[PDB]
Ligand SMILES: [Ca+2]
Ligand SMILES: [Ca+2]
Ligand code: NA
Ligand code: NA
Ligand code: NA
């Protein structure tokens with residue numbers, strides 16, 4: 001099941017304005033990866049300049065004591081995922097990222113490595129969206145067309161990153177999704193939120209609150225430290 | 234060709250805050266439809282409560298002197314489009330609207346009625362997006378998955394409605410689209426803009442400016458009255 005195998009750190013936003021790349025989440029990255037991970041595999045596909053993206057991510061991970069391989073430098077991305085000790089999918093355009101995961105045959109390979117082999121997964125922004133059941137609640141523009149909005153399904157609910165309190169407001173847009181048939185919960189992570197998933201346990205971390213939307217129900221609001229395990233099953 | 238057959242009125246936004254539904258565009262609706270049109274066929278699919286939407290649109294069109302039929306009350310939507318004297322597609326969620334046009338077999342039927350038979354088409358917001366080549370530059374959330382982002386193709390360029398001057402800014406999001414291969418121009422219509430297309434002529438109307446994005450180029454900015462015929466070919 002998920003109990004001994006799933007490890008996810010799902011970050012809303014990579015950079016606090018004025019802060020460094022991954023700075024506000026760096027302590028929980030260290031605790032999450034530990035020293036049993038030596039190199040992280042980065043997926044840069046959400047941004048167009050993958051070389052510049054990978055160089056940026058590498059500088060930060062090397063500072064934290066990890067090597068960084070970018071899948072876009074491997075001749076065989078599936079093999080790179082097969083060998084990964086940890087996977088980090090960064091932010092950018094969520095549709096570009098999801099289409100690239102399908103185009104490179106990485107949906108099944110990443111799900112396998114994370115949920116079957118127990119490899120830790122870090123997402124930020126678009127990379128948090130693609131950890132979820134689907135990208136239905138992204139904020140991004142549909143600049144390309146993936147073959148489905150279904151994503152890695154590492155968790156069975158949706159996430160709206162960089163959730164924004166009151167052109168439809170964010171809650172209005174999420175309410176329309178919940179007009180659709182049988183749609184799953186939508187966890188609104190504000191900019192300072194991250195969700196740590198360890199097996200069947202999920203915990204809100206960071207310094208901002210998260211707003212939980214359920215179909216047909218009034219949203220319920222949740223403080224850092226909040227137990228979200230019930231969203232997993 | 235388009236010269237004697239295409240008639241489009243593409244509105245960015247249906248309601249100015251504080252104003253009435255379609256009030257800021259009502260003079261150009263009257264001039265566009267004339268008295269040779271007696272009834273308008275409404276497509277309400279962008280919103281969930283289609284009955285309430287149709288009642289709202291009908292009140293406004295009846296005030297302007299037109300009957301209003303809603304396709305969602307016809308037993309055969311294709312037949313309703315075949316018989317329409319004019320088509321109005323209103324705002325709501327663009328993905329819900331486009332998927333519903335495909336689900337109801339209306340993409341080919343509306344293109345035929347407008348571009349081959351010369352029936353006038355009015356779009357607002359989501360209904361302006363679906364008049365274009367594709368919905369790649371919508372602002373809306375992907376709450377459902379149409380089978381393609383290709384739309385009615387009544388014009389060969391993209392439109393970003395409710396364009397917003399400086400979470401990626403609007404220009405940043407459009408610039409990412411133009412990182413993609415061979416993407417067409419993106420006309421940014423601000424809230425007060427509408428585009429009148431008559432055959433091979435296109436004219437910006439209203440009381441706000443429009444910002445034109447071309448792949449690899451600095452955006453060029455355009456005053457009401459501006460001739461956009463070059464975007465059509
Ligand atoms: Ca997003
Ligand atoms: Ca839109
Ligand atoms: Na994004
Ligand atoms: Na694998
Ligand atoms: Na999601």
Ligand code: NA
Pocket residue numbers: 324325326327358359373
């Ligand atoms: Na909309």
Ligand code: NA
Pocket residue numbers: 314315341342343345346
């Ligand atoms: Na037709």
Ligand code: NA
Pocket residue numbers: 362365366367368369370371390391392393
């Ligand atoms: Na468009």
